[PDB]
Ligand binder design. Sequence first.
Ligand SMILES: *[C@H](CC(=O)O)[C@H](C)[C@@H](O)/C=C/C(=C\[C@H](C)C/C=C/C(C)=C/[C@@H](C)C(=O)[C@@H](C)[C@H](O)[C@@H](C)C/C(C)=C/C(=O)O)CC
Ligand SMILES: Nc1nc2c(ncn2[C@@H]2O[C@H](COP(=O)(O)OP(=O)(O)NP(=O)(O)O)[C@@H](O)[C@H]2O)c(=O)[nH]1
Ligand SMILES: [Cl-]
Ligand SMILES: [Cl-]
Ligand SMILES: [Cl-]
Ligand SMILES: [Mg+2]
Lengths: 200, 1014, 121
Amino acid sequence: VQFKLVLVGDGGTGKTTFVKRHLTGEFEKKYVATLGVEVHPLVFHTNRGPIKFNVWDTAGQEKFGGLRDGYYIQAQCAIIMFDVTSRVTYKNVPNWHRDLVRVCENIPIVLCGNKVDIKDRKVKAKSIVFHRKKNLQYYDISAKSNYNFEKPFLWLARKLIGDPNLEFVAMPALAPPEAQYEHDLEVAQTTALPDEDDDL
Amino acid sequence: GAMEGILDFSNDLDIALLDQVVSTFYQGSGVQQKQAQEILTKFQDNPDAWQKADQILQFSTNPQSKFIALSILDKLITRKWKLLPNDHRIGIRNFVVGMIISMCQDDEVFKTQKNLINKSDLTLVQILKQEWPQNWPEFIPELIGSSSSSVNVCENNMIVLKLLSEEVFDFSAEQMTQAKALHLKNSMSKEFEQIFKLCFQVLEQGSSSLIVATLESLLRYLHWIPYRYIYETNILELLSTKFMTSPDTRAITLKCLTEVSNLKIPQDNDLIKRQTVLFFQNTLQQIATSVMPVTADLKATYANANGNDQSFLQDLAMFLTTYLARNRALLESDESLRELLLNAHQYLIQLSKIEERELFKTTLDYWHNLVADLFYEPLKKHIYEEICSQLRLVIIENMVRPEEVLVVENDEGEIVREFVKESDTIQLYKSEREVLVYLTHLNVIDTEEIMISKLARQIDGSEWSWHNINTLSWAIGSISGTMSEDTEKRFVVTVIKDLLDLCVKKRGKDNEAVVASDIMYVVGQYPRFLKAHWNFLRTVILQLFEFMHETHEGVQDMACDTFIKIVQKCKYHFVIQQPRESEPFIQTIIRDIQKTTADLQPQQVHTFYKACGIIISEERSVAERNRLLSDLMQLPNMAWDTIVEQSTANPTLLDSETVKIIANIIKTNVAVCTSMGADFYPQLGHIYYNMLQLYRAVSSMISAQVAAEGLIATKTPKVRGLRTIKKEILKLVETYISKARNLDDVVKVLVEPLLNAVLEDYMNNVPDARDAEVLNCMTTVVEKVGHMIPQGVILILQSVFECTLDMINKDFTEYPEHRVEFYKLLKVINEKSFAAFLELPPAAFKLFVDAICWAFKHNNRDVEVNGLQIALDLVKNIERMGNVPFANEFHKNYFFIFVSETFFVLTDSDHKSGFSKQALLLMKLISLVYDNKISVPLYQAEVPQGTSNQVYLSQYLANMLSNAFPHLTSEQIASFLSALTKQCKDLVVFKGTLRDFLVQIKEVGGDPTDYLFA
Amino acid sequence: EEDEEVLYKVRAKLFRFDKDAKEWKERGTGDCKFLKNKKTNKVRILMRRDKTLKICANHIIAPEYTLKPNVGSDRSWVYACTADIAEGEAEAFTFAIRFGSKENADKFKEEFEKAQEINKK
Ligand SMILES: *[C@H](CC(=O)O)[C@H](C)[C@@H](O)/C=C/C(=C\[C@H](C)C/C=C/C(C)=C/[C@@H](C)C(=O)[C@@H](C)[C@H](O)[C@@H](C)C/C(C)=C/C(=O)O)CC
Ligand SMILES: Nc1nc2c(ncn2[C@@H]2O[C@H](COP(=O)(O)OP(=O)(O)NP(=O)(O)O)[C@@H](O)[C@H]2O)c(=O)[nH]1
Ligand SMILES: [Cl-]
Ligand SMILES: [Cl-]
Ligand SMILES: [Cl-]
Ligand SMILES: [Mg+2]
């Protein structure tokens, strides 16, 4: 019951961080550049049943680009990512779109403006209009704050299943079951938790 | 494993094995897909890999294999084409053309392998960019001829032309030199007449797939082609009628027609005007008859999302808004065109009702455009009276939540404080306000009537809902300013009376929260009213004070924000003694501050205090102001005084509860200082010396704790708490100095003890224990009084320069705050107190230069930008010194370092964001030599005697470039430097030459004459 | 969830300790719930992520578990869990869980221990 999703955009825009957050819930602080592509299954539970995205997280750095447009072959949907604190990333959005739609002629695509958590935004709301003529859905997002993080997938799923009333639903919770750990616990207590200045 | 064999080139390529590996990557999963992926990437990267292409195309049974083959060629063509022997060029061209021909003739292939054919076409187009027309003159005539023989070939040819037009006109700026872009554009222009003829014929002789392809090509042509091709042919009729009727062609046609609505068009041509009318008229007629009438529920349709309905409605919105924005005046004067004008707008109305935010923004942009024109252009607004009336309704009923309204409804049906700011609706609200404001002005009676009566339908309960009262309330607040004071007066009265009624009736905590949020929003939006109605104002503020005791956290928080929002505009009325009042209201607020703020969180308490400070600064009598300040600070100052005793008796504020108290005291001071600025000074005086003592004590605690517990201690709540004290102290001083009017006192009283308290502490702490805020504080200090304290500037540098540099020079990521503040500090010092750098020992001055170049290697814009600016300012600073030994020695030591380092980041493709300022800096450095502003030889007798710096610079640069980019020819390099040097006074030309160089370094065989572009 | 009484609910952020790497990684943010089975009287922790509603914690509040402090925080607990099935198959984790406030952290611990005594019966 699965769909190939290609994820494209300039290096540093937060593609891989965005996926990881969806995969495991973690926020990866470090920038480790993707090498070619990284494929990752990602399931969502919906009122129309479960939907499976096979996420192809591609490299943004030219030098690490691997097969490039080769990755887009038979993609069924896409996400174009930019960084609202980096104007050049937005400038490049038409280049990523061009390369993408040349291979994938008729697919639903979300434009995403990442890193809106950052105080000093550079790509103004007002400027973001590229999506209009190209029939892309647009969302301000933050992989760090989780602001609108679910939106691209909810939309894509509505489009691909052909049901605008599709919702994410709660996966039924099966009843859970009923000594080196002492060393391991200590290490954990004494390792500080990140972002202690967050609201949660 | 088995798969790795394709990487061994000494053996023949096992095609079957290739296909397995490709299949494994595309259709596999897990570890095997990953391995396959790596193999294919390696294969692809092999610079001989292209030699295998023909073979793969021939014997492969796997389309993805062939795709990858083509990507390999593409890379070859785009980067090393001219490096190849002539035979290999022809050979590649032939099997590419041949493949395309062959795939187009087999119907099944043509039908089922569209991706491969497309990839093939693009690959051809790449060959053209290199070879066409100079070495392929007949390609267009042969393309045209071939088209007549087959529907498949013809259709494919359109794909090729589309791609060509894209590559040449739409995407060439970043990918080609100015000269090459001009060459290809010209070439396409010179042959378009025949291209168009083919395009037109096909469109008249109406195969749908062919027609669609042809139309897609047209969309691209429309970007650049002369207008006469559009207007002096029958093509407009075809697009606006024939191609609108069938849905297979409608989408593209509409997009073509949108582009047409943007063509280059004579303003005084009656006939062309007529045609621009006709195509609109036709198009709207087809919509009405073939798609949906003007009365249709587009909101419903969109929401159902059948077929391609959403994209169609999107494209329609785009068509209508683009056209009308440009041409609506053509429909405004002729009576016979009125219906059409209004119908067009009625469609837009219907479109505006759709629940899609991005789409709504598109239409909202148009409305704004309309209304702004109706506001100024005479005899126009009456035409649109009905449209506008309907529009008022749409907007009022779709007002998005203002940033100020802190309550929202949860999934459980509960009205609660928002978790986060709805950052994505800020701009939407503004835009909605703007349009609505304009609409109100256009007809104030209608707007008021709509609102008053909607509000009535809430009271009596007929239309009552949270959504409905909210949107209304928001709309009401948003039109503040639109009315005359007098009308506004009456208007506001009616509204408040009703909201008050509504409050009385709608009980329960959820309802109450909603009605509260809305009343606060409205009242905060109408200060003018408030200023005129003291009794009312007073009663509002007291009610806000009650809300400060609300258990409902949303209401409470909003009460604080509204209080300050109100004060920000009405502060004057709080500071004077009102008629029939015993005291100025500020007195009353201060007296009862402990009560009022009892249930507030500290940050809210601070906001409250900040607000009071705004009021107090209205009092311009010094004696009376200082007295109010004193009164306001009474509680924090007494808490303070008692702590200063206990603390000085025994440094063991180890108690965490005391730590929070201290922090909040200082935070309160910060809050008041922020609003009072220069007026804060007497209060600053009360606490200053003890504050700096406290800074010292806390600093010792932190260090003691680190010593006793290790670096981990810095993560503990205790130590974080202690640092907060230090940070807030630094903040208070920063805030005050940034606003100070009396600089003499800052220097004489504030600065020496500050420096004494903070510099050595920063210097002598371990890296992890150092506050970036010190750097930030120091920047403000240098910024404001740096000129007056040259020795102090020295002291700052000595204390923070090297030790900070050593923190941030191992990588680009660690200590990100320090990094940013460090370069802001150096920036301001370089600007305001350059002498401080002159006094540095040579070793340190070298580090400074290093520090600068390290800055522009950051991708981090915050660091990068300051890096470049410093470099530029530094050069200016040196230049300004004139022919003196320091300036001389500087150039001898560092000129080329700056030149080379700037070139490096220009050329590495990892610093694209800094291009402009990089260019500027480079231009300055070159111009310095070009203008003989360097008194000494930049060489040493490594070159002949009396050799100009001009001649040497070129030599240095050629050699540098030659070695850095060995694939370039000597003439390419020479040509490039000639252009660049000659152009060192014209930044825009100079930048163009730089860009041209960036293109040429990515390929082989770049034409040196390209640098003659002019 | 149908056959279960909600004894306690608090908004939390949950972390798991990666041992291989030497770091805490976030596992989810949302409502952490204490659920009591009406039929077995057993009490579990059930936490789901916001928006996605994906389960990030699903384990019995075992009597043997102990809430320990973290060196970095006064509003968090850490404890070793031996049977969490959020990801699917039963797995051992060292969890950390942070709250909006110290009050909230303290209220959780108390409830946590009350639940433990229930699971004892
Ligand atoms: C529910 C109230 C309830 O149960 O009755 C809501 C949530 C209230 O808690 C919120 C109240 C707020 C503001 C009020 C608007 C402030 C009260 C003002 C008031 C009664 C002022 C008096 C002095 C008037 O002037 C009255 C008598 C007069 O009728 C006014 C309202 C009209 C005017 C000003 C006529 C004029 O010409 O001046 C939340 C901020
Ligand atoms: N502040 C903030 N940082 C983010 C956000 N998303 C990602 N980042 C940060 O941005 C950096 C790059 O993230 P990454 O996922 O590698 O981006 P990428 O597009 O995959 N890069 P590449 O294309 O090279 O693989 C990381 O330091 C990451 O922590 C966000 O929403 N906010
Ligand atoms: Cl293919
Ligand atoms: Cl005022
Ligand atoms: Cl040469
Ligand atoms: Mg990545």
